[PDB]
Amino acid sequence: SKGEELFTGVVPILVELDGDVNGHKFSVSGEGEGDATYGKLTLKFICTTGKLPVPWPTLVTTLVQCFSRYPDHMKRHDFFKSAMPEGYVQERTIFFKDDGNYKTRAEVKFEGDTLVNRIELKGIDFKEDGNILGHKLEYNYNSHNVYIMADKQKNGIKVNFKTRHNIEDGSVQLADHYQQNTPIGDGPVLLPDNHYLSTQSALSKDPNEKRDHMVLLEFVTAAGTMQNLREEIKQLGREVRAQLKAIE
Amino acid sequence: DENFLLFFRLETPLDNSVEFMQIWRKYDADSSGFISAAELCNFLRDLFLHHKKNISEAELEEYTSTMMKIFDKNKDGRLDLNDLARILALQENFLLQFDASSTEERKRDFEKIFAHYDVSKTGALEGPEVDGFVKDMMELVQPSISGVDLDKFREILLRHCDVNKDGKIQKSELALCLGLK
Ligand SMILES: C[As](C)(=O)[O-]
Ligand SMILES: [Ca+2]
Ligand SMILES: [Ca+2]
Ligand SMILES: [Ca+2]
Ligand SMILES: [Ca+2]
């Protein structure tokens, strides 16, 4: 498929975020590239307004899920690549338990050969020394699944997942993500069966950058969909394996 | 050339895991999960006299010692499952012979598979027929099984697919717990 065709090789990526959280204005510029064949993303983000008023891990989700590896017997479910090159709108509400909430609107489209993500963010009701404005979050990310359901109503998909951000305390800050995705340029898109995205993110620093910044490595893969006899022999084996490991 | 090495000429490869498990179950006398030197010599003594070649027990000890040196990977004095699969020349996992998603092609493959492991032609998997199937099935999902685990594995497998609770796995039972018509 032509959309599926655009992610054959390595695609350069550009990301621009402009945010408003409890009055503090900031901007983030992101460069990198994505390799959908491997579900890989390497990106460097830089805050252009000096110090960032929120911790970097709270922005990983907002700062392009069209680079996910879809197992080829799940290509029918690849919605983010079926909306290309015209692109889609990604709207999110992120509720931080016992704290404020981000609401983001984003356009992800092809501008030439470059995949571009332009985001406006509004954070409100945050607490000045909650873990966000107090910069109390640890510099890492925890892997999890991202659950995807169809939304025939809006010709898009509803997505929902919870991330957990560690604190120095050994505590955990819970962020409840609610998001919808809609094609920008109209046309035929693929609305998928219920499935999830297994994503893991590593956060590093460029030793040579004095600006506030985040280096990001990301791996995303689709799963949760279903055949021949050996695969039934396999899951019988996996269930036998599971049972032996319990009694031990 | 050299004495010994006769045994490799005497060794015809094994196509089936069931027959390997019969030999394994036969010479692990203490059910320790490994093959000792004493037990290996018992296996070699019987293997030779079925071919009616004749060996004084002096060179039976000698050739047993030679085989331990060669195939005991970690020199602990014990051969494990794959140390003996090498000796008996067991070939590739039979289950690797198998895309068929149709309901009738899967029944066709299930017949070929159950025919392979039902050597006894009883219509039910029993004894080393379970072990052979368990070995080939487990090695599709994890590195490799230990000899001590197979008594655990058979117990677990029966609690999954023994619907009538008689101690053996009939054809219909294996078909049902694989999810087949
Ligand atoms: C245990 As091996 C596969 O090296 O014979
Ligand atoms: Ca033993
Ligand atoms: Ca050993
Ligand atoms: Ca039988
Ligand atoms: Ca039974």
Coordinates of C-alpha atoms and ligand atoms in Angstrom, one line a residue:
Chain A
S1 CA 0.0 0.0 0.0
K2 CA 1.2 3.5 -0.8
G3 CA 1.1 4.7 2.7
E4 CA 2.8 1.5 3.9
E5 CA 5.2 2.2 1.0
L6 CA 6.4 5.5 2.5
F7 CA 8.1 3.8 5.5
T8 CA 10.3 1.2 3.6
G9 CA 13.6 2.8 4.5
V10 CA 14.8 5.4 7.0
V11 CA 12.7 8.5 7.1
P12 CA 14.0 11.8 8.6
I13 CA 11.8 13.3 11.3
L14 CA 11.1 16.8 12.5
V15 CA 9.2 17.7 15.7
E16 CA 8.1 21.1 17.0
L17 CA 6.1 21.6 20.2
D18 CA 4.9 24.8 21.7
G19 CA 3.4 24.5 25.2
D20 CA 1.5 26.3 27.9
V21 CA 1.5 24.7 31.3
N22 CA 0.3 26.8 34.3
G23 CA 1.3 29.9 32.5
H24 CA 4.9 29.0 31.7
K25 CA 5.6 29.1 28.0
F26 CA 8.2 26.9 26.3
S27 CA 9.1 25.3 23.0
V28 CA 10.8 22.1 22.0
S29 CA 12.4 21.2 18.6
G30 CA 13.1 17.6 17.7
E31 CA 15.3 16.0 15.0
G32 CA 15.9 12.4 14.2
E33 CA 14.8 9.6 12.0
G34 CA 12.5 6.5 12.1
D35 CA 12.9 3.0 10.8
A36 CA 9.4 1.4 10.6
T37 CA 10.8 -2.0 9.4
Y38 CA 12.4 -2.3 12.8
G39 CA 9.9 -0.1 14.7
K40 CA 12.9 2.1 15.7
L41 CA 13.1 5.8 16.5
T42 CA 16.2 7.8 17.4
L43 CA 15.5 11.4 18.2
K44 CA 17.1 14.4 19.9
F45 CA 14.9 17.0 21.5
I46 CA 16.1 20.5 22.6
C47 CA 14.2 23.1 24.6
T48 CA 14.7 26.4 22.8
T49 CA 13.4 28.7 25.6
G50 CA 16.1 27.7 28.2
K51 CA 15.1 25.6 31.2
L52 CA 12.1 23.3 30.7
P53 CA 9.3 23.9 33.2
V54 CA 8.2 20.2 33.3
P55 CA 10.3 17.0 33.4
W56 CA 11.3 15.4 30.1
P57 CA 9.6 12.0 30.8
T58 CA 6.2 13.7 31.0
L59 CA 6.7 14.7 27.3
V60 CA 7.9 11.4 25.8
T61 CA 4.3 10.5 24.8
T62 CA 3.5 13.8 23.2
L63 CA 6.9 14.3 21.5
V64 CA 4.6 9.8 15.5
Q65 CA 3.3 6.2 16.1
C66 CA 3.5 5.6 12.3
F67 CA 7.0 4.1 12.8
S68 CA 5.7 1.1 14.7
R69 CA 6.6 -2.4 13.4
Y70 CA 3.5 -4.1 12.3
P71 CA 3.9 -7.9 11.9
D72 CA 2.9 -8.4 8.3
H73 CA -0.1 -10.5 9.3
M74 CA -1.3 -7.3 11.1
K75 CA -0.7 -4.8 8.3
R76 CA -4.5 -4.5 7.9
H77 CA -4.5 -2.9 11.3
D78 CA -1.9 -0.3 10.6
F79 CA -4.0 2.8 10.8
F80 CA -1.2 5.5 11.3
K81 CA 0.4 4.6 7.9
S82 CA -2.9 4.4 6.0
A83 CA -3.5 8.1 6.6
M84 CA -0.2 9.1 4.9
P85 CA 1.0 11.2 3.3
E86 CA -2.0 13.4 4.1
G87 CA -1.6 12.6 7.8
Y88 CA -3.8 12.6 10.9
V89 CA -4.7 14.7 14.0
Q90 CA -3.7 13.3 17.4
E91 CA -5.6 14.8 20.3
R92 CA -4.7 13.7 23.9
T93 CA -5.9 14.5 27.4
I94 CA -3.3 13.3 30.0
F95 CA -4.6 13.2 33.6
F96 CA -1.8 13.1 36.2
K97 CA -3.4 11.6 39.3
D98 CA -3.4 14.2 42.1
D99 CA -2.1 16.9 39.7
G100 CA -2.9 18.8 36.5
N101 CA -3.6 17.7 33.0
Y102 CA -2.1 18.3 29.6
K103 CA -4.3 18.6 26.5
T104 CA -2.4 18.4 23.3
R105 CA -3.4 18.7 19.6
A106 CA -1.0 17.6 17.0
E107 CA -0.8 17.2 13.2
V108 CA 1.5 14.5 11.9
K109 CA 1.9 14.7 8.2
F110 CA 4.5 14.4 5.4
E111 CA 6.1 17.7 4.4
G112 CA 8.1 16.4 1.5
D113 CA 10.2 13.4 2.4
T114 CA 10.2 14.5 6.1
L115 CA 7.7 13.3 8.6
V116 CA 6.6 16.2 10.8
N117 CA 4.9 16.5 14.1
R118 CA 3.6 19.9 15.1
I119 CA 2.1 20.1 18.6
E120 CA 0.3 22.6 20.7
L121 CA 0.1 21.7 24.4
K122 CA -1.9 23.2 27.3
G123 CA -1.3 22.2 30.9
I124 CA -3.6 23.5 33.5
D125 CA -4.4 23.1 37.3
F126 CA -0.9 21.7 38.0
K127 CA 0.5 22.0 41.5
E128 CA 3.5 24.1 41.7
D129 CA 5.4 21.5 43.8
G130 CA 3.7 18.5 42.5
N131 CA 6.1 16.1 40.9
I132 CA 5.8 17.9 37.5
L133 CA 6.4 21.5 38.3
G134 CA 8.7 20.4 41.2
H135 CA 10.9 18.4 38.8
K136 CA 10.7 15.3 41.1
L137 CA 10.6 12.6 38.3
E138 CA 13.4 10.2 37.6
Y139 CA 15.2 10.4 34.2
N140 CA 14.0 7.1 32.6
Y141 CA 10.9 5.5 31.1
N142 CA 9.0 2.3 31.8
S143 CA 7.9 0.0 29.0
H144 CA 4.2 -0.8 28.7
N145 CA 1.4 -1.6 26.2
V146 CA -0.7 0.9 24.2
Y147 CA -4.2 -0.4 23.6
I148 CA -5.9 0.5 20.3
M149 CA -9.7 0.3 19.6
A150 CA -11.6 1.4 16.5
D151 CA -14.0 4.3 16.6
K152 CA -16.4 4.0 13.6
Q153 CA -18.2 7.1 14.8
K154 CA -15.2 9.5 14.2
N155 CA -13.6 7.5 11.4
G156 CA -10.6 7.0 13.7
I157 CA -9.3 5.2 16.7
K158 CA -9.6 5.6 20.4
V159 CA -6.4 4.8 22.4
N160 CA -6.0 4.5 26.1
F161 CA -3.1 3.5 28.4
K162 CA -1.5 4.4 31.7
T163 CA 2.2 5.3 32.2
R164 CA 4.0 5.2 35.5
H165 CA 6.8 7.6 36.2
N166 CA 9.2 6.7 39.0
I167 CA 10.1 9.2 41.7
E168 CA 13.2 9.4 43.9
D169 CA 11.0 8.2 46.7
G170 CA 10.4 4.9 45.2
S171 CA 6.9 6.2 44.6
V172 CA 5.3 6.3 41.1
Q173 CA 3.4 9.1 39.4
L174 CA 0.5 7.8 37.4
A175 CA -0.5 9.5 34.1
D176 CA -3.8 8.5 32.5
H177 CA -3.6 8.9 28.7
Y178 CA -6.8 9.4 26.7
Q179 CA -6.4 10.0 23.0
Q180 CA -8.2 10.0 19.6
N181 CA -6.7 10.1 16.1
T182 CA -8.5 11.4 12.9
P183 CA -7.3 11.7 9.3
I184 CA -6.3 15.2 8.2
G185 CA -6.8 14.7 4.5
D186 CA -9.9 12.7 4.1
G187 CA -9.8 9.3 2.3
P188 CA -9.9 5.6 2.9
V189 CA -8.2 4.5 6.2
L190 CA -8.0 1.1 7.8
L191 CA -9.9 0.8 11.0
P192 CA -8.3 -2.0 13.1
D193 CA -9.4 -4.8 15.4
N194 CA -8.5 -4.4 19.0
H195 CA -4.8 -4.7 19.5
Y196 CA -1.9 -3.2 21.5
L197 CA 1.5 -1.6 20.9
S198 CA 4.5 -2.9 22.9
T199 CA 6.8 0.2 23.3
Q200 CA 10.0 0.7 25.2
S201 CA 11.9 4.0 25.5
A202 CA 15.5 4.8 26.6
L203 CA 16.4 8.3 27.6
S204 CA 20.0 9.6 27.4
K205 CA 22.0 12.8 27.1
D206 CA 24.3 14.1 24.4
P207 CA 27.5 15.0 26.3
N208 CA 28.1 18.0 24.0
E209 CA 24.8 19.8 24.4
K210 CA 24.5 22.5 27.1
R211 CA 20.9 23.3 26.3
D212 CA 18.2 21.4 28.2
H213 CA 17.7 18.3 26.0
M214 CA 16.7 14.7 25.7
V215 CA 18.1 12.0 23.5
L216 CA 15.5 9.3 22.9
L217 CA 15.7 5.7 21.6
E218 CA 12.4 4.0 21.0
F219 CA 11.2 0.5 20.0
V220 CA 7.5 -0.1 19.2
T221 CA 5.8 -3.3 18.0
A222 CA 2.2 -4.3 17.3
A223 CA 0.8 -7.5 18.8
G224 CA -2.4 -9.0 20.2
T225 CA -4.0 -10.4 17.1
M226 CA -4.3 -14.0 15.8
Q227 CA -4.0 -21.0 12.4
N228 CA -1.5 -23.8 11.7
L229 CA -0.9 -26.7 14.0
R230 CA 2.7 -25.9 15.2
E231 CA 1.5 -22.6 16.6
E232 CA -1.1 -24.5 18.6
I233 CA 1.6 -26.9 19.7
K234 CA 3.6 -23.8 20.7
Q235 CA 1.0 -22.2 22.9
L236 CA 0.4 -25.7 24.5
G237 CA 4.2 -25.7 25.1
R238 CA 4.1 -22.2 26.5
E239 CA 1.3 -23.2 28.9
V240 CA 3.2 -26.2 30.0
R241 CA 6.3 -24.1 30.5
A242 CA 4.2 -21.6 32.5
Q243 CA 2.9 -24.4 34.8
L244 CA 6.4 -25.9 35.5
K245 CA 7.8 -22.6 36.5
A246 CA 5.1 -22.1 39.1
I247 CA 5.7 -25.3 41.0
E248 CA 9.4 -24.3 41.7
Chain B
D1 CA 43.4 -47.4 12.4
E2 CA 42.0 -47.5 15.9
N3 CA 40.0 -49.9 18.0
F4 CA 36.6 -48.5 19.0
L5 CA 34.7 -46.3 16.6
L6 CA 32.9 -49.5 15.7
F7 CA 29.9 -48.1 17.6
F8 CA 29.4 -45.2 15.1
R9 CA 29.2 -47.7 12.3
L10 CA 26.8 -49.7 14.4
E11 CA 24.7 -46.6 15.1
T12 CA 21.9 -45.9 12.6
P13 CA 20.3 -42.5 13.2
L14 CA 17.0 -42.2 15.0
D15 CA 14.1 -40.5 13.2
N16 CA 11.8 -40.4 16.2
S17 CA 12.1 -38.9 19.7
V18 CA 9.9 -41.7 21.1
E19 CA 12.5 -44.4 20.5
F20 CA 15.2 -42.1 22.0
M21 CA 13.1 -41.7 25.1
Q22 CA 12.7 -45.5 25.4
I23 CA 16.5 -45.9 25.4
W24 CA 16.9 -43.0 27.8
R25 CA 14.2 -44.3 30.2
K26 CA 15.9 -47.7 30.0
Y27 CA 19.4 -46.8 31.2
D28 CA 18.7 -44.0 33.7
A29 CA 18.3 -46.6 36.3
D30 CA 18.3 -44.3 39.4
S31 CA 16.0 -41.8 37.6
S32 CA 18.6 -39.1 38.3
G33 CA 18.0 -37.3 35.0
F34 CA 21.5 -37.9 33.8
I35 CA 23.5 -40.9 32.4
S36 CA 26.4 -42.0 34.6
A37 CA 29.5 -43.9 33.4
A38 CA 28.2 -47.2 34.9
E39 CA 24.9 -46.7 33.1
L40 CA 26.5 -45.8 29.8
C41 CA 28.5 -49.0 30.0
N42 CA 25.3 -51.0 30.5
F43 CA 24.0 -49.4 27.3
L44 CA 27.1 -50.1 25.3
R45 CA 27.3 -53.7 26.6
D46 CA 23.8 -54.5 25.4
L47 CA 24.2 -52.5 22.1
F48 CA 27.2 -54.7 21.2
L49 CA 25.7 -58.1 22.0
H50 CA 22.6 -57.5 19.9
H51 CA 25.1 -57.2 17.0
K52 CA 26.8 -60.2 18.5
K53 CA 30.2 -58.6 18.3
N54 CA 32.3 -59.6 21.3
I55 CA 34.2 -57.4 23.8
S56 CA 36.0 -58.3 27.0
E57 CA 34.8 -56.1 29.9
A58 CA 38.3 -54.6 30.0
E59 CA 37.8 -52.7 26.7
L60 CA 34.1 -52.1 27.6
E61 CA 35.4 -50.0 30.5
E62 CA 37.9 -48.5 28.1
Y63 CA 35.5 -47.5 25.4
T64 CA 32.9 -46.3 28.0
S65 CA 35.6 -44.0 29.4
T66 CA 36.5 -42.9 25.9
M67 CA 32.8 -42.0 25.2
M68 CA 32.5 -40.0 28.5
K69 CA 35.6 -37.9 27.6
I70 CA 34.2 -37.1 24.2
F71 CA 30.5 -36.2 24.9
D72 CA 30.5 -35.1 28.6
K73 CA 30.4 -31.4 27.8
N74 CA 31.2 -30.0 31.3
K75 CA 33.3 -33.0 32.6
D76 CA 31.0 -33.5 35.6
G77 CA 30.9 -37.2 34.9
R78 CA 27.2 -37.1 33.8
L79 CA 25.7 -37.1 30.3
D80 CA 22.5 -35.1 30.0
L81 CA 19.7 -35.4 27.5
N82 CA 21.5 -33.7 24.6
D83 CA 24.8 -35.4 25.4
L84 CA 23.0 -38.7 24.7
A85 CA 21.0 -37.4 21.7
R86 CA 24.5 -36.9 20.1
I87 CA 25.5 -40.5 21.0
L88 CA 22.3 -42.1 19.5
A89 CA 22.4 -39.8 16.5
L90 CA 19.0 -38.3 17.0
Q91 CA 18.1 -36.1 14.0
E92 CA 16.2 -32.8 13.7
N93 CA 13.0 -32.2 15.6
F94 CA 10.2 -33.9 13.8
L95 CA 7.7 -31.0 14.4
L96 CA 9.8 -28.6 12.2
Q97 CA 8.4 -30.4 9.1
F98 CA 5.3 -28.1 9.5
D99 CA 1.1 -22.6 7.0
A100 CA -2.0 -24.8 6.7
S101 CA -4.9 -22.9 8.3
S102 CA -7.8 -24.7 6.8
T103 CA -9.8 -26.9 9.1
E104 CA -9.2 -30.1 7.0
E105 CA -5.5 -29.5 6.4
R106 CA -4.9 -29.1 10.2
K107 CA -6.7 -32.4 10.8
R108 CA -4.5 -33.9 8.1
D109 CA -1.3 -32.7 9.8
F110 CA -2.6 -33.8 13.2
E111 CA -3.0 -37.3 11.9
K112 CA 0.6 -37.4 10.6
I113 CA 1.8 -36.0 13.9
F114 CA -0.1 -38.4 16.1
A115 CA 0.9 -41.3 13.9
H116 CA 4.5 -40.3 14.4
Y117 CA 4.3 -40.4 18.2
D118 CA 1.9 -43.4 18.5
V119 CA 4.5 -46.1 17.7
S120 CA 2.5 -48.7 19.7
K121 CA -0.6 -48.2 17.4
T122 CA -2.9 -48.2 20.4
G123 CA -4.6 -44.8 19.6
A124 CA -3.3 -43.2 22.9
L125 CA 0.0 -41.7 23.9
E126 CA 1.6 -43.5 26.8
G127 CA 5.0 -43.7 28.5
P128 CA 7.9 -42.7 26.4
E129 CA 5.4 -41.7 23.7
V130 CA 4.5 -38.7 26.0
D131 CA 8.2 -38.0 26.6
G132 CA 9.1 -38.0 23.0
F133 CA 6.2 -35.6 22.1
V134 CA 7.0 -33.4 25.2
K135 CA 10.6 -33.1 24.2
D136 CA 9.9 -32.1 20.6
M137 CA 7.1 -29.7 21.8
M138 CA 9.1 -28.0 24.6
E139 CA 12.1 -27.4 22.4
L140 CA 9.9 -25.1 20.2
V141 CA 9.4 -22.7 23.1
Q142 CA 12.6 -22.8 25.2
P143 CA 16.3 -23.8 24.9
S144 CA 16.2 -27.4 26.0
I145 CA 14.8 -29.6 28.7
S146 CA 16.6 -31.4 31.6
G147 CA 16.1 -35.1 32.2
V148 CA 14.8 -34.3 35.7
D149 CA 12.0 -32.0 34.3
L150 CA 10.4 -34.7 32.1
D151 CA 8.6 -36.4 35.0
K152 CA 7.4 -32.9 35.9
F153 CA 6.5 -32.2 32.3
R154 CA 4.4 -35.4 31.7
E155 CA 2.4 -34.7 34.9
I156 CA 1.6 -31.2 33.8
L157 CA 0.7 -32.3 30.3
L158 CA -1.7 -34.9 31.5
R159 CA -3.6 -32.4 33.7
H160 CA -4.1 -30.3 30.6
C161 CA -5.3 -32.9 28.1
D162 CA -6.4 -36.1 30.0
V163 CA -10.1 -35.4 29.9
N164 CA -11.3 -38.8 31.0
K165 CA -8.5 -39.0 33.6
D166 CA -7.2 -42.5 32.7
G167 CA -3.5 -41.7 32.6
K168 CA -3.0 -41.8 28.8
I169 CA -3.7 -39.3 26.1
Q170 CA -6.1 -40.6 23.5
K171 CA -6.2 -39.1 20.0
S172 CA -9.4 -37.1 20.7
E173 CA -8.0 -35.7 23.8
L174 CA -4.8 -34.3 22.2
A175 CA -7.0 -33.0 19.3
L176 CA -9.3 -31.2 21.8
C177 CA -6.7 -29.5 23.9
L178 CA -5.0 -28.2 20.7
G179 CA -8.3 -26.6 19.9
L180 CA -9.3 -28.9 16.9
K181 CA -12.6 -30.2 15.7
Ligands
LIG1 C1 24.0 -30.6 22.9 AS1 24.6 -30.4 21.1 C2 23.1 -29.6 20.1 O1 26.0 -29.6 20.9 O2 24.8 -32.0 20.6
CA2 CA 21.4 -41.8 36.3
CA3 CA 27.6 -33.1 31.6
CA4 CA 0.0 -45.5 21.8
CA5 CA -7.3 -40.0 28.6

